[PDB]
């Protein structure tokens, strides 16, 4: 049997990867950045509380204008919230109430939805009739839909729990490109600002870098010890942060292909649902299962601040494009805006 | 101190809040039931009885009571990443046939489908999201089980079992074995039933068990039970 041979060759290549990463590691981010000034304590009060939902909120996304946001909960409805005047722009009833992901378009025209039903439904917000209607159904995937993120107006990248990630075409409705590298259920998806590459974090404790146009996996990151639930790109686009169930946020570089540092604390033992970056990138915000949000410092590996507003598990966390505020949702049906 | 459009927008938000309250009241009056059957099971039958690709849902009203039917048999993924979505359900129906003790899965010859069903039931009962959620146990294919007992002994699946090859004693032993996996004996109740060909009887049992669970939940919320 030459399958064993193949196994040996794969092990040798993994040894080559770890040897190259160890050889390239001349220093660490902690000893480089220990000379700069500390961030200090950061206290954010609750500017606004959005209270329209009646069930547990799973996902949220910010608009390009950083005023309109989209919220999804188990009542079977997507709610478009106005941040400044706490108003409800739209209430979209879902065909399937088992929603686990929602996305707002960069143009502002469409709202993506998905969940335990295998469909990232696209809703048109700018109809002539004045109501919000389903654009089409996207039924290619078999597993539960984990994350939709509008790549563009006509193209939408998505991840599901059938171990694959697909890039769809809005007009045609067919599965334009399918990425099958992962060996575990994919949970988190994040897009780069230059809109060419994207990172997918799965339950095989590895984060994979993918190319949009070409279609193959560039790099893999195997630092985590457990299911990676959240992933988010650094604003530069050369790094990304991952949050998993082992109470550890890990920052990975695309160019260096290694984990610079790990953000963990002894008191924290719970899993990480959602991680986001600030506009500068100095602050890493991470939700937690123990009813809490930790504003870690992305360079000093220190806790800049704590946000303890919510009464239940924080499942979604987003930061505006201008970096003005951070919206956090949870399972008590409340969205809080902090700045 | 706000614009005319701003006012109109606030009025629109109030109307949306109304619609949301009305829809929440409409959703709250329905009783939710999840279904869980390891491998081959009576799911295909039970759903048909209730009526008279992802998650499938059917709506039906029995004795002026609206039932939400949730089935997860098409989800071939890790369950722990989405089982937390079913925290707020009222009942969980675990469907397990009795004719699977001799039959084995087509992945491993040594293990039995009954032990796999016991493992899944243990996992669901000891799950942290289902501490307050009641479980209704359904036992399927009584007649083919009786034929198998007349043809084959029960000791092939339980070596520690010692008793006569009689349907009543074997069914009692299987029911006791399933109900002994409930580690939380106080906060959880198991409603064991033997499913039959008559559609009305199974739905009636569901209605009675659901009625009891609703009464217990309301009393626990009040603090009396």
């Amino acid at each position: 049997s030459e399958l064993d041979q193949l196994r040996q060759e794969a092990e040798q290549l993994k040894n080559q990867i770890r040897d190259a990463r160890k050889a390239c590691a001349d220093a660490t981010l902690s000893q480089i950045t220990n000379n700069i000034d500390p961030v200090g304590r950061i206290q954010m009060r609750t500017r606004r509380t959005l209270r329209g939902h009646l069930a547990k909120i799973y996902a949220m996304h910010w608009g390009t204008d950083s005023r309109l946001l989209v919220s999804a909960s188990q009542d079977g409805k997507l709610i478009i919230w106005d941040s400044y005047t706490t108003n409800k722009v739209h209430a979209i009833p879902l065909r399937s109430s088992w929603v686990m992901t929602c996305a707002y378009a960069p143009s502002g025209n469409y709202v993506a939805c998905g969940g335990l039903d295998n469909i990232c439904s696209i809703y048109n917000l700018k109809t002539r009739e004045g109501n919000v209607r389903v654009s089409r159904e996207l039924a290619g995937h078999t597993g539960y839909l984990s994350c939709c993120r509008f790549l563009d107006d006509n193209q939408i990248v998505t991840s599901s729990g059938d171990t694959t990630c697909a890039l769809w075409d809005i007009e045609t409705g067919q599965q334009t490109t399918t990425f099958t590298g992962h060996t575990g259920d994919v949970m988190s998806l994040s897009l780069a600002p230059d809109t060419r590459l994207f990172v997918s974090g799965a339950c095989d404790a590895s984060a994979k870098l993918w190319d949009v146009r070409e279609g193959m996996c560039r790099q893999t990151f195997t630092g985590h010890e457990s299911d990676i639930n959240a992933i988010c790109f650094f604003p530069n686009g050369n790094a990304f942060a991952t949050g998993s169930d082992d109470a550890t946020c890990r920052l990975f570089d695309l160019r260096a292909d290694q984990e610079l540092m790990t953000y963990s604390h002894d008191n924290i033992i719970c899993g990480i649902t959602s991680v986001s970056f600030s506009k500068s990138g100095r602050l890493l915000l991470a939700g937690y299962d123990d009813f809490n949000c930790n504003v870690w410092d992305a360079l000093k590996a220190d806790r800049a601040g704590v946000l303890a507003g919510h009464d239940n598990r924080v499942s979604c966390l987003g930061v505006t494009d201008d970096g003005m505020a951070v919206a956090t949702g949870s399972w008590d049906s409340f969205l809080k805006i902090w700045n | 101190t706000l614009s005319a459009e701003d006012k109109a927008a606030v009025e629109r938000s109030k109307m949306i809040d109304r619609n949301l309250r009305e829809d929440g009241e409409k959703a709250a009056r329905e009783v939710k039931l999840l279904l869980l059957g390891a491998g081959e099971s009576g799911k295909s039958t039970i759903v048909k009885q209730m009526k008279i690709t992802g998650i499938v849902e059917t709506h039906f009203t029995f004795k002026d009571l609206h039932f939400k039917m949730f089935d997860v048999g098409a989800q071939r993924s890790e369950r722990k990443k989405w089982i937390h979505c079913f925290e707020g359900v009222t009942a969980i129906i675990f469907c397990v046939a009795l004719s699977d003790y001799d039959l084995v899965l087509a992945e491993d010859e040594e293990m039995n489908r009954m032990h796999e069903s016991m493992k899944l039931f243990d996992s669901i009962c000891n799950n942290k999201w289902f501490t307050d959620t009641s479980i209704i146990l359904f036992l399927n294919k009584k007649d083919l089980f009786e034929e198998k007992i007349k043809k084959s002994p029960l000791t092939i699946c339980y070596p520690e079992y010692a008793g006569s090859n009689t349907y009543e004693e074997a069914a009692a032993y299987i029911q006791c074995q399933f109900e002994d996996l409930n580690k939380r004996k106080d906060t959880k109740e198991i409603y064991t039933h033997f499913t039959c060909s008559t559609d009305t009887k199974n739905v009636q049992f569901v209605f009675d068990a659901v009625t009891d669970v609703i009464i217990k939940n309301n009393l626990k919320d009040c603090g009396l039970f």
Partner: single-chain antibody, 232 residues
């Protein structure tokens, strides 16, 4: 999206008449509705407004307590009951649909209107410099209007609307909130202003742009301009 209304014709003075409008092709329950009056020689004059939830019913000062506006959402019909008509109401009536939310385009669609003929202060006014200008095709023309009060509210939105009424056709919304273009409006129309003086500019004018331009405010309750007629 269609609005067909009826109930016009000859009305004796002091009588009562009901104008009935039927809306098809869009969601009628979620839209606020307006009634706008246009004299044969004068400009558009606002008459009434009803919201989506049949609340915040607003009237003009000249018709307050004399006209009652109501709607029926399952039948998708808007009715205006007019009582004690004088000789100042012998004018075309237009049904306008407006939805109000962040980024919306209210006053987007106008009805065809019904002729009704009767047999024989403390409001924001709009000032127009000139009423008729000669324009040639392919040229750029700017039309300026003034407001008695600064329309820049504290939330950063200036409430000015521009309407085009071609001869023999209903008014069409061109620019809303003095900057944003409406759906179906070509990109050569543009608007600018500071709070009092407002300018609409047309570059590379086409023969289909010949009509009357009306400016409206929407800060408080709604007044139109006199209208600028464009001639070849």
């Amino acid at each position: 999206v269609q609005l067909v209304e009826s109930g016009g014709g000859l009305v004796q003075p002091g009588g009562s008449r009901k104008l009935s409008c039927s809306a098809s092709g869009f969601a009628f329950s979620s839209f606020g509705m307006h009634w706008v009056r246009q004299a044969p020689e004068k400009g558009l004059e606002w008459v009434a407004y009803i919201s989506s939830g049949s609340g915040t019913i607003y009237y003009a000062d000249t018709v307050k307590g004399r006209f009652t506006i109501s709607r029926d959402d399952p039948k998708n019909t808007l009715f205006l009951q007019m009582t004690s008509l004088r000789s100042e109401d012998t004018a075309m009536y237009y049904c306008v649909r407006s939805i109000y939310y962040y980024g919306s385009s209210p006053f987007d669609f106008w009805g065809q209107g019904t002729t009704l003929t009767v047999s024989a202060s403390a409001d924001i006014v709009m000032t127009q410099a000139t009423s008729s200008v000669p324009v040639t095709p392919g040229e750029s023309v700017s039309i300026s209007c003034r407001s008695s009060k600064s329309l820049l509210h504290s939330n950063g939105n200036t409430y000015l609307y521009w309407f085009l009424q071609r001869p023999g056709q209903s008014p069409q919304l061109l620019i809303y909130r003095m900057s944003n273009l409406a759906s179906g409006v070509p990109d050569r129309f543009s608007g600018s202003g500071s709070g009092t003086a407002f300018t609409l500019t047309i570059s590379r004018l086409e023969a289909e742009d010949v009509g009357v331009y009306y400016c409206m405010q929407h800060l408080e309750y709604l007044t139109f301009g006199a209208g600028t007629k464009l001639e070849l």
